[PDB]
Amino acid sequence: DAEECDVQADIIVLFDDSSSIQYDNKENYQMMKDFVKELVDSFTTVGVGSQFGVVQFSQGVKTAFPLNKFKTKEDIKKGIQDMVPRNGGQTEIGTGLKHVRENSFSGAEGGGNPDKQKIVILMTDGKSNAGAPPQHEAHKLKAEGVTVIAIGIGQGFVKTELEQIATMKNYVLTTNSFSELSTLLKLVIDLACEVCVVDCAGHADIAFVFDASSSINANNPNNYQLMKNFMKDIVDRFNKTGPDGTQFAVVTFADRATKQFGLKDYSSKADIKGAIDKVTPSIIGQTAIGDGLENARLEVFPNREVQKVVILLTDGQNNGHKSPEHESSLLRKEGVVIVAIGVGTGFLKSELINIASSEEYVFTTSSFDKLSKIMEDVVKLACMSCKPRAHKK
């Protein structure tokens, strides 16, 4: 039966009106409209309050209507129906995103109330082939507490680009044709009804997946101890540890991967911190990032509803044995949020981006003694939990 969302929210739909849409098919725009109308119906609070706005983008940007124009569902659907696609000769996804933050959520247009979720739903049939670069504008949008969902129709977009734009890679949805948009209705709602929150008092399963290569202590023999203190300091940021709170695990990887201890092994901070201290590095100069992630997936997370998180750290590039992008995908698909940290000059930032849940969850630092400069931003993510709030009827 039907999907509903009771969450109070200011919701902006970024609506592609490029020439490409009209050309492919005469009835494409209408299916787009019908899709948005169903989104409007799926939100209980709309017209009691929860609001809705639409911004057209392609060549330049045009606001169809702001949050504070239509105070009831049916009036919003009319506004959507009365929309006139300008059929633009280019596609400016960054320009569209820029408009949405500066204007769409402004007090003038009906936003600025921190009591409501800010949601943006992007629909495009292609790649941002003009105007500002998307990622940057997206970065700032999201920084302001805005959830960005991105929908791609057809083949002329690049899923890569939608993954940079969206909150997380799994906030990107794709469909072959406009005829099939409706098949994304449920998923879009589920995603929009997520209430993301930073709370270190909440329950979580956190796996450290750390490099154990010999290369770490090469330039300085206290580096591995610095890594270990980084972990210890993270454990101490959580209110309560153990089965009734936040559990912890540690997996190291050098040439292969080794589970040092699992989630259910200890319950107190001091027991977990001491367990971390027990951990030693290897004599091998290899970084099997892939094995590390594999181990976490097979040995750690099945052996404990709570938020699963992996914190990955490496000072080198992957050796080869196992595919980090494949193991990470499977973890991501199981609901594991992944944070990637790189230290030094021997890792590949491109690998970290591919494994992390979002480029925004990737951190770098020149040395291990500079690690505490990212403690906060990493803890912020580790303490983050997103709860689904969509149901039926």
Asked whether the domain spanning 203-393 has the same topology as the one spanning 1-202, the reply is: yes
Residue-wise burial string across 23-47, b where 16 or more C-beta atoms lie within 10 A, e elsewhere: eeeeebbebbbbbbbbbbbbbeebb
CATH code that applies to domain 1-202: 3.40.50.410
Residue 389 · residue 194 · CB < 8 Å: yes
HEC-encoded secondary structure of 201-248: CCCEEEEEEEECCCCHHHHCCCHHHHHHHHHHHHHCCCCCECCCCEEE
d(CA 277, CA 279): 5
Residue 326 is assigned to a ligand binding site:
no
User: What are the angstrom distances between the C-alpha of 167 and each of 3, 120, 140, 262, 353?
Assistant: 22, 10, 11, 29, 14
Q: DSSP H helical segments within the chain, as ranges?
A: 19-24, 28-41, 73-81, 93-99, 134-143, 159-165, 185-192, 216-219, 223-235, 269-278, 289-295, 324-333, 349-355, 375-382
Residue 18 is assigned to a ligand binding site:
yes
The pair of three-digit structure tokens given for residue 325, joined into one six-digit string:
């992008």
Residue 20 is assigned to a ligand binding site:
yes
The residues, ordered by sequence, that sit 6+ positions from 191 with a Cβ below 8 Å of its Cβ are 147, 149, 171
Domain 203-393 matching CATH 3.40.47.10: the answer reads: no
The pair of three-digit structure tokens given for residue 124, joined into one six-digit string:
């495009």
The number of angstroms, rounded, from the C-alpha of 306 to the middle of its chain's C-alpha atoms is 17
Residue 16 is assigned to a ligand binding site:
yes
Under DSSP, the state recorded for 50 is: B
Backbone phi and psi for residue 258, each to the nearest 5 degrees, phi listed first: -135, 125
Residue 391 is assigned to a ligand binding site:
yes
Residue 31 · residue 21 · CB < 8 Å: no
d(CA 113, CA 104): 13
Radius of gyration of the chain (CA): 23
* H or E stretch covering 296: none
Domain parsing of the chain, residue ranges: 1-202, 203-393
d(CA 232, CA 272): 8
Residue 271 is assigned to a ligand binding site:
no
The pair of three-digit structure tokens given for residue 36, joined into one six-digit string:
């948005």
Method for structure elucidation: X-ray
d(CA 40, CA 29): 17
